[model samples]
Target chain A: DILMTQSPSSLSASVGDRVTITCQASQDINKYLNWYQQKPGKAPKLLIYDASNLETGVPSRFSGSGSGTDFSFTISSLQPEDVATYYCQQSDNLPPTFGQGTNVEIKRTVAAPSVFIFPPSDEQLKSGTASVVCLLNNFYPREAKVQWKVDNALQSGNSQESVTEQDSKDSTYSLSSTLTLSKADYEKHKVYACEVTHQGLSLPVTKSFNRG
Target chain B: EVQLVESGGGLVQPGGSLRLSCAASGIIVSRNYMTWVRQAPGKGLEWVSVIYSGGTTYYADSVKGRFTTSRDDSKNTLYLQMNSLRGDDTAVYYCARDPPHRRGSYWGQGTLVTVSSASTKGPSVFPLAPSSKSTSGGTAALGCLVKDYFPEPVTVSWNSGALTSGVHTFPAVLQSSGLYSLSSVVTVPSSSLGTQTYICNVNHKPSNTKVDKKVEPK
Candidate 1:
């Protein structure tokens, strides 16, 4: 079985930002490689093959490149709607196989770093009603667990988020986790971290951001 | 559009004979290759052979030695005949056309023919007959039967894998429905069925035709 593994397991990008995914094969798969896009409750659509050639009827913005074992799929410009998982499959044998998947989050975090804002100043800033946003970089499985910690204390904010993805990238599954921070916390420049847990993987990976 | 009207049903005694027909409609039968296919009581399909309007034919190596297929360009009809029948020859046979080149995409409704002296609805099984002793210099007979056909036209051709010399004969018989039955019989060297595959096919009206599945001897 030629297994495929993806990198980062997740991604963080803003609208109009470019996002890239890496797919590596266990061995040399030659040109018998393909990509697919899968959405919830729907069949997967073919994307790329032979390493880089785009299949007929696919969009131009989604392109695949690389050969031998290391291949990559790049989304030229990310959109608010492009937030689903992307997968890679190799068709070198009878029964084809696919990689895990990389989930992308549309929400941005507004958490401030601890060193940037002292407690006395932070309190003063919070009293001033300063607003900062800390977004959970990448989420998966749609129902992932996400939370935030500010100066070792947990804080909650309004989570206004929506999900979308390309019809061309509908082969694998993924989820997203987003963390929102309070306006007062935003002004203090406090340290904020977002953690996500998924199946198969051993533990959760956390990404941190600072508020200015 | 193209249609296939085959015979309703048929029963032949073991060690006797059986024949069936598949009539075609709508399409130009002469330009395409009419073929035959068989499906067990419940199983996948198998390719029989292809017959041309001009009477030229080809069959799978397994049946090429003992089967014959013939066509009628004017009537757009096809016929199949199989001889030396046994109980293991029971199956639901269908007629179809070889669209372009591959096996078959278009198919006829299908006619169930059983090689039994009695009509009993047990499990319909098509097992291969016991092997016969090699008859090198003697003569042998091979036949195929097809039914539920339309367009009032059909064709049959005799084939023996590679060796081709055989005596072709056509006979008209009356059915219980008072409809006339068309048949094509070929007498080839006993070596043909013993040495190669002899197959008979119905080639006319290309579209959605099923294939005849060959039962391998256990």
Candidate 2:
């Protein structure tokens, strides 16, 4: 069975936030990926089909990209009614599979972390090794869990997190976790997920690396 | 008044054939195009086929050759036919017409169809295992892991109501044992963590099973 794994089980995005949801297939599903959005008590509405074609009647704000194992669905500028869970399903294989749905909701005052992932630098890649960094910033209360996954496996290279820092004025927290991997492994289409879990968030916030 | 009416729907045994009619008022079937859409109970919509005024037809990948679409001008109606139907073919079939475009502006109330002789297993629904999405200051995250089910689609209702936002259910995954398992979650204010009580009520299709469970976060 070709399993589809989706990240950031739930996201807290306010209106106008450019929300991106990605789905990765265990193997190549080619252009058979489809995206759907569902409101409460209603059937799921198809937004994108065959990787990126916007379904007829859907608003222009919704778009899609990528192929094979890595695909993404983007809401250009989130609208209020867009507050619903989005899902990705691969139609390529027998016994079709779907990513664990991604939830997009309003960002309340939980001071949730704003996460960013930086790709490997040239210097690191040249040494037959690659290193990426994940930054979690502007979160309050100072408690969060960082998980590094390589190709859906927990052992994501030699990862180390810098000491959490406090903003001088805002007093919010900031931190980064760096990982080292073999250069060839990254180029082979292996995906890296920097899953950040915060107490204030319903699900972990996840970002990917080396997704093609 | 422009009315679109669909024929009565009924049960069809597996490997059986079925045909449905869509009668349109205020429009001639010969001069315009028509479409057929179907939604499995508690699932997404599937565009079956489109019959054009010029006699061309377009079909969705899911129902490519097993279905056919046609129209009758004298009767001012459209037709949809299915061959060798199966359990998954169970859905509410609809017929529609739009303003010379792909979107459906006029639609039928939809008729239900069930294919016979399919096996189903009810889900063993578990209580919501919840934790705070933050400190005592914020939201409580509720997760209900529903396991051991048959067939494809199932729905979990949170708060025992349509509280709408913050509710998501993953697609059913077929486990090695041949049954299915999936997860559903809902987020509510942290204040409801232990005192207010959260709920997860699951309804599985084909089996027609509805189960309810409540949890108080520890």
Candidate 3:
């Protein structure tokens, strides 16, 4: 099989940093390869083919060139719109294969707050309980889940919470939910787990914190 | 609007060698590389090799030791062949004219070759089993059929994925209506699949990578 190898598994860059990738073949294949880009939650789109030829509708910012077994693909000026994974594929052979892929992460930093602890602290109570008096502003359409557990065992019971929908910059809906654990069942990390799922692409999006 | 008129049928006996041709008439078959591809019953296409009218040739690394090609400038015919044959050697072959350095655009109709049960009895008639297996690691052959059009030489080569190298050229056989047909065979190893791609690229005029990449399957 015509082997394909790529480098740099991951890269960190600012909004306008330029990036480049190269694809090489075992022998002289002239220029019969293609390239694609994919972001989370969406299918990959063709960027280059036949080495340097650009696929229709592709942005001009993306370009490819090379001959024989050596080839290169370049993205002149990266944009927030270009923050996603990229891949290379060869169509000259049957059952074409693809390269592993490169993940591009945008850089950012921040710091905040005192951690909290809730009734789910001890893993022995059949029911859990915790209360906090605070204004929950940005906590709408909360994609997070709440539950109760006893002595390291998760328990299913009736506890209800509610929220009101609000508009967002991305034009998507927001959601949230709240639950009350009974005092007899509050166990630390024993029976409390929060699960969250959402659209779009990104990781560590849904996170859990230890309640003090 | 380039058209490829490839030649018709051929009959070769078991254990014997067979030769076929694909001649380009309306276009310069030599300007681009002519590639031979094969498809057994129910099987996907397989890349064999490619050549130009000038007589240059490149063989797939895996199958380098098995196949060969030649060209006849006087007749404008591209010839392909295999030394030994068996019932399992039957297939429909096609010639795709691609650029010397890129993919292909137009393809010859096709030429069917039959390798009957090693028999002298007027060419064995038993239908061979279809080869549905992928041409990845084992030996494979590709055929091309071109006829009628000449003067414009067609080039063929063997490629796996975006990588291609082995190439050859055959002569153009001119006719009254400029219509012609023939078959070319490309022998290669099966392991070249998925990871490698062989293309039959053809270009009319001299151009850079830009003109070559324009040729895609219709």
Candidate 4:
């Protein structure tokens, strides 16, 4: 088994900064080294294989170099979306091995928002007013709004919104708004839309729900 | 586009045997090599074995005794038979086409396998004293030692700028108690005499323990 040693286990870089990570193999692995990137909640993506050749669809800024035991993976200009853990593996020997991961974090002054929608429960839709919630989480600069619509028509009734709260872990914000409609109106199978508008969004993020 | 599909039983009792099949399409099985790789739950990937379409096979030294690799040209399929399974064998196995220059160009969706009855005891990491030997031109050989690591197949590496450039590793020897003992040596140049700080990192996969020893300039 060949051993891979990766250096500087973790690093912090700003957008537009150049970043490089190194991996050393214990033996001559020739050009059989591969590099991969893994973000939170996602599978690893191959960036470079055969030492320096970019995998199909990889960006030009991502490049790899070195042969035999010495190798390096470099990002010429870091992007916010490039924040993730990077790994190196060697296939030159039997029982290929991987280096301990290197975490590359982007030093961000602001963050974009991600949204989700929580629809009314079956019991609420059957007996009382149907209430739905739209959650806007993981956004920086807490200013955002939630707009409601029914069947593509703007809605402005029985709605309540909450003040944003800071997430203790990532220093982002989370907030939600509830839209309530009469059971009769919900039973009519009208489409309910939760559109979230944030300063970072080019267009509002929307999610729709309809009765079964 | 070439495709490889893996299929096998998901559960195997300790000391049992497992036979897995990798069926390939859109390519000639007799012309390319087939390899099997596996990943333990929440752990790193491991290469198991590779078999050439011409019937030659190579196994990882660590698992050479327990794994068998074979291929069938008539059916365009590859086979893996692993016996004396243990709990640590629980992993998702994938089959891939082994190209000459680039490996794993095409891979199959992984198949999960679970070994129900096996021991999960971790190994104790002990950092031995660093040893040095004098050489010409003011260069010196530095050694790091680790002992009593369990569940064979540990990885060790030095913290020098380039991997293994000035390093030499002694083969890991298995003890009668089933634990492992290993050592690695790196040569230090005179230019780095006083500023050198070498680190030895050891990983025991089955135990999930990573230990590092930093050797400061003396």
lDDT of 1 by residue, A1-212 (tens): 56688775778786677888898888887766666564432323456666687766666778888878898898887765566656676655423456776766554433221111011123323334332222222223334455556565665543222232322222122222223333554655556555545443366655554443
- For candidate 4, lDDT tens digit of each residue in B182-209? 5554556645644666676666646454
Task: Compose the digit string of candidate 1's lDDT tens values, residues B12-57.
Answer: 6776655667788875677776767664443324446567667677
DockQ of each: 0.00, 0.05, 0.01, 0.06
For candidate 1 chain A, the 10 contiguous residues with the lowest summed lDDT are A112-121
Candidate 2 chain B: worst-modelled 10 consecutive residues by lDDT: B97-106
RMSD of 3: 25.5
Deviating ranges (above 4 Å) for candidate 3:
A108-212, B1-218
Better candidate by lDDT, 1 or 4: 4
Docking class of 1: incorrect
Better of 2 and 3 by TM-score: 2
List model 2 lDDT by residue over B146-180, tens digit each: 66676656777776675656554655555545667
Per-candidate TM-scores read 0.29, 0.44, 0.32, 0.50
By lDDT, the better pick of 2 and 3 is 2
Candidates 1 and 2, the one with greater TM-score: 2
Model 3 chain B poorest 10 in a row by lDDT: B121-130
Ranking by DockQ: 4, 2, 3, 1
RMSD of each: 32.2, 16.1, 25.5, 25.9
Q: Rate the local accuracy (lDDT) of all candidates.
A: 0.50, 0.68, 0.46, 0.69
- Model 2 chain A: weakest 10-residue lDDT segment is A162-171
Tens-place lDDT per residue, model 3, B59-170, is 5443355567666666666667665666555666776554433333456667766665422221100111112342446543322322223223334333322333211123
Q: What residue runs in model 1 are displaced by over 4 Å at the alpha carbon?
A: A108-212, B1-218
